[PDB]
Every structure is written in C-alpha cells, then in structure tokens.
Design a protein around this ligand. Structure first.
Ligand SMILES: *[B@@]1([O])OC2=C(C([O])=O)[C]=[C][C]=C2[C][C]1[N]C(=O)[C][C]1[C][C][C]([N][C][C][N])[C][C]1
Length: 359
C-alpha cells in the first residue's frame, strides 16, 4: 500500500504536468526519512525510444550554481578566501577594474551592481574575451543594493574561488568536489563511455538541444547528472555532518541567508522560503520577473541559518532541459525533478508542491 500510495501521489503530480507541457521524459527522486525513492517517466530520446531511468543524464542548468557554491564553501572552509574579500584580490587581470570595489559575497548573491543575466553574444568561451569583458564592466548601481540574477556574477565568484585554491574550476569539480560528494554519474564534460545515458533535450518544434560551449559555462550551468546522483547531493545537503569535515563546512556555507527579496532568502546557490508557504508564493519567488528584473534587497543584520521549517530550492534551465531541486532540512525531505524540456518554472514548482504536500 505505501509503495502504491507513494507511486499514486507522484503519478498524480507528474503525469498531468508532463502532458500539459509535452515533456518527453522526466525523472523524480525523493529522499524520505533517509530512504531514496525513484520514479521515471517517458523517453530520454524520442528518436530511439530509450526510456528515462534514475541513471539517465539530464542538463540541470543553473542548479549547477549550487555545486559552484559548494566549491566556494570549500575555499572558505580552507581559509583561501573570505566573502568580504574584494574580487580583484583573487585575479590580477581585474586589478584597477571596478572589481576592486566588489566583494565575493556581492558576486555570489547577484548584488555586484547590474552584471547581466548572460554574457553578451560577443563573449565566447575564451579566457582573454572573459578577462576583457570584466575589465571594461561598470556597475549600473551601488554594489550590495539590487539583486539581478546573473551568470557572469556567480560565474566569476566560482572562477575566483577556484583561483583561490590554485587550480582550474573544472579540474577541482572533477578531481575533488564530485568524489568528496560520492558523485560518479555527475559531469561537466560527459565521458565518451557515458554518452549513451545523456538524454536528448527538446525545444520549439521538438528541435534537439544539448548545451553548447559558453563563457564560464561550467560555473553557471554546465552540470549533467542523473536523478540518483542529484538526490545524493541533496542527501549530502540534508546531512553535511556525514561528510569529512572540510566538505561538511563547504555544504554548511551554502545554508546561510544574506538578504530577502519578497518571500525569498538568498544564500550561496540556494534560495530559501518559510515552510509551509502557499504554492502561489513559491511560484512567484521562482517567476520570470525574479530571474529578469532587478529587485532592491532587504539585507539581514546577520547571516541567517537556512535550516528547520524552510524549503531550500533552485531551478535550472537550458534550451532543452528543465530541472528543479527542493529540500526541507527540518523534515529530512528532499526532491529532484529532471526533465528534457525547458518547461515553465511555475509547472516544476506545481509538481514539487503536490509531492511535498502529499508527504
Ligand atoms: B539558469 O539555468 O537559471 C536560469 C533560469 C532558472 O532559474 O531556471 C531561468 C532563466 C535563465 C536562467 C539562466 C541560467 N541558464 C542559462 O544561462 C541558459 C543557457 C545560456 C547559454 C546558452 N547557450 C547559447 C548558445 N551559444 C544555453 C542556455
């Protein structure tokens, strides 16, 4: 009955949203009282009819920023950097730029002063173009005043964290972070031997879409992982104390809120809400205006522990994929929803809400 109840609950949440958004395949993973549960739907590739499993690789887009924050947490834990460090202390090519006046915290939390959603199309994945972009950049407003969701912002934060550790970002992620987290199905660059597991993404007219190279892609949106591995990451977030001490500290650094915008408390990577809260309020916190418009922040007097009766979440999108992760620390509850369509965030939250309410 409990298997049937749980399959009934997840089916009732997922199936209508998959039909309504024409999602070819979707993988759900739930952590409930320290037990994993997997629900797999539809097709990883329509063309060959490969089915979604808990080992299928999906692009998770901006959920990658929670990994980036974890590498920064590790640099913090090892005293290689501090959140109030000036950005240019960690990259000489930025010295003399406006990044002399911008903290790592500002970049991490999108408050550096109007760094845009994306690098402009003119900036390719090239070290010199990225250096020249940041050197010439000027804030639109005061650092620390307005949140504007930004790849270049948290991207630079992860790149500087990696420089502080004396190694490239992508090497640190593959050689240190993923192994420390027990993640063997999590990739920035999918190995040839694992390509059979990589789902096809679908956009308008079902055009096939896997993410192409871009400046600080790894930092902003580069992760491919399975529902099984992303739920392991969620379980590490729910129990940092089970990891070796420096990684425990790295994960705790991602559970600290610095400011509020509406119902949302901004941490490093993770965005937090009180729990319970209405579905409409959780959808609004993950809405298009929150991604695309600047918002004045309400700074907290001291960083707040993101634990207890709160929901921590992150949405992630690429042109072909739509991911959502959410966990409730105080209820030992975790959830991963990976899909091979970029379907609206409101719809991803609709599935999660139905599941989390059901439990
Ligand atoms: B990220 O996934 O977060 C994000 C959301 C969200 O939170 O779900 C909504 C809207 C935008 C973003 C930004 C992030 N994702 C990307 O930046 C998408 C990425 C950008 C580069 C593209 N490549 C261009 C081709 N040369 C691929 C999509």
């Amino acid at each position: 009955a409990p298997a049937d109840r749980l399959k009934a609950l997840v089916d009732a949440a997922v199936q209508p949203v998959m039909k309504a958004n024409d999602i070819p395949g979707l993988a759900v993973a739930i952590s409930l009282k320290g037990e994993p549960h997997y629900f797999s739907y539809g097709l990883a590739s329509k063309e060959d009819g490969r089915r979604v499993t808990p080992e299928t690789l999906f692009e998770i887009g901006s959920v990658s920023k929670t990994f980036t924050a974890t590498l920064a947490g590790y640099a913090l834990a090892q005293d290689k950097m501090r959140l109030d460090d000036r950005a240019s202390q960690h990259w000489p090519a930025l010295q003399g730029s406006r990044f002399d006046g911008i903290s790592l915290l500002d970049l991490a939390t999108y408050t550096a002063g109007g760094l845009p959603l994306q690098f402009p199309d003119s900036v390719q994945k090239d070290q010199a173009q990225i250096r020249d972009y940041y050197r010439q950049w000027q804030p639109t407003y005061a650092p620390g005043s307005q949140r504007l969701y930004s790849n270049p912002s948290i991207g630079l934060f992860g790149y500087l964290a990696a420089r502080s550790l004396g190694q490239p970002f992508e090497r640190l992620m593959e050689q240190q972070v993923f192994p420390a987290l027990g993640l063997e199905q999590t990739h920035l660059d999918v190995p040839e031997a694992a390509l059979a597991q990589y789902a096809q993404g679908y956009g308008k007219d079902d055009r096939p879409l896997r993410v192409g190279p871009g400046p600080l892609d790894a930092e902003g949106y580069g992760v491919k992982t399975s529902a099984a591995d992303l739920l392991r990451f969620v379980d590490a977030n729910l129990h940092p104390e089970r990891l070796d001490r420096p990684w425990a500290q790295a994960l705790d650094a991602t559970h600290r809120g610095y400011y509020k915008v509406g119902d949302m408390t901004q941490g490093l990577g993770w965005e937090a809400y009180d729990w319970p809260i209405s579905l409409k309020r959780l959808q609004a916190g993950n809405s298009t205006p929150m991604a695309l418009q600047p918002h004045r922040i309400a700074r907290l007097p001291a960083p707040q522990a993101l634990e207890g009766q709160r929901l921590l979440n992150k949405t992630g999108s690429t042109n072909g994929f739509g991911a959502y992760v959410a966990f409730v620390p105080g209820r030992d509850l975790g959830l991963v929803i990976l899909a091979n369509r970029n379907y609206p965030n409101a719809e991803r939250v609709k599935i999660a809400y139905a599941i989390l309410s059901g439990l």
